[PDB]
């Protein structure tokens, strides 16, 4: 999975 | 943005 | 700040 | 768009 | 609740 | 499994 | 502030 | 527990 | 202690 | 697998 | 490395 | 501040 800071 | 993988 | 799972 | 607020 | 599934 | 901010 | 894994 | 300061 | 296991 | 905050 | 500024 | 995954 990927987690991104908006 | 900027992203990490987990 | 917002951190979102893709 | 499942997100936490950090 | 301020959570995301990981 | 989840990440939660408190 | 804390981030906790459960 | 499994927590870090953030 | 600055890391958690995920 | 580790998530670290520095 | 697998990092994001937060 | 950084979040890193290893």
């Amino acid at each position: 999975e990927q987690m991104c800071i908006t | 943005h900027d992203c990490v993988n987990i």
Side-chain angles (χ1 to χ4, degrees), chain A, chain B:
Chain A
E1 45 173 1
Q2 188 177 228
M3 205 162 282
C4 306
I5 284 273
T6 287
Chain B
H1 51 205
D2 193 19
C3 305
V4 286
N5 252 217
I6 317 133

